């Protein structure tokens, strides 16, 4: 897509979601971007990592803190193929990231407007901007484990 | 009073000792220990700045260490003792851990997600319900908010 755009980074998250094919649930892929540069990548690997927190968004935030040598990732934007859960939404507030961009909503456990809104809770110390709908048609297909293979040349 | 072995107050004192290792972190020192069948399977304290990990909270390390020993990201029937009420990020990890009970001492009137800022653990839309027990060693845990330790 157009370079350094929301749809551009969403395609990177869609590719990473394929690594979560052998996980119980919707495959989620996440990428953490700061100043048009990748500082963190992640996919769902709870069973593969024996970590109850090994979500796509969390692995991207965990890798970003190692790259930035700081648990605070100011002005960073996190691209996820799925609406964050209550655990992932809480991690973005503590990371103080600038924005989360997810494609399709999680009408079962999503914490960005569906089941609740943890990112926009009035009692929070940080506000993370929310942008939804980026590559929504392809991200919605991830709910049924569908991936795209378009025509080449 | 009397603190029986393998009891809630017994494990809370173990978490209070672990909290000393998080004294050099921005915020109140929190200590957590994960217990399954009266055996320690996970320990943790605040190490966000020391490890460059925004998720390096006390309860999360116990769940992360617990998942490593249990060889399973699902820690059924496990009890998590923390010196502080969990935040929104830690409380979300306990739902995914499928632990049986969380035991925290004092409430977190700033970032707590177990009654203070919200109650996510008992939300009806969750796939798992974690039992809540609060107030265990509250006096020794409330002093931890002001960096006070008993001698
Ligand atoms: Zn999540
Ligand atoms: Zn926490």
Residue numbers in the entry:
A (entry chain A): 3 to 155
B (entry chain B): 1 to 151
Lines quoted from the article behind this entry:
To confer the favorable attributes of ABEs upon a CBE, we envisioned transforming TadA into an enzyme capable of robust cytidine deamination and subsequently generated an improved class of CBEs that uses TadA instead of a naturally occurring cytidine deaminase. Here we describe the development of two families of base editors, CABE-Ts and CBE-Ts, which use variants of TadA to catalyze the deamination of cytosines with either retention (CABE-Ts) or loss (CBE-Ts) of adenine deamination. To illuminate how amino acid substitutions identified from directed evolution affect TADAC’s substrate tolerance, we determined crystal structures of TadA*8.20 from ABE8.20-m13, the template used to evolve CABE-T1, and TADAC-1 variants from CABE-T1 reported here.
In addition to the perturbations on the right side of the TADAC-1.14 active site cavity, evaluation of the TADAC-1.19 structure reveals that other substitutions (E27G and I49N) from our evolution caused major structural changes on the left side of the active site cavity.
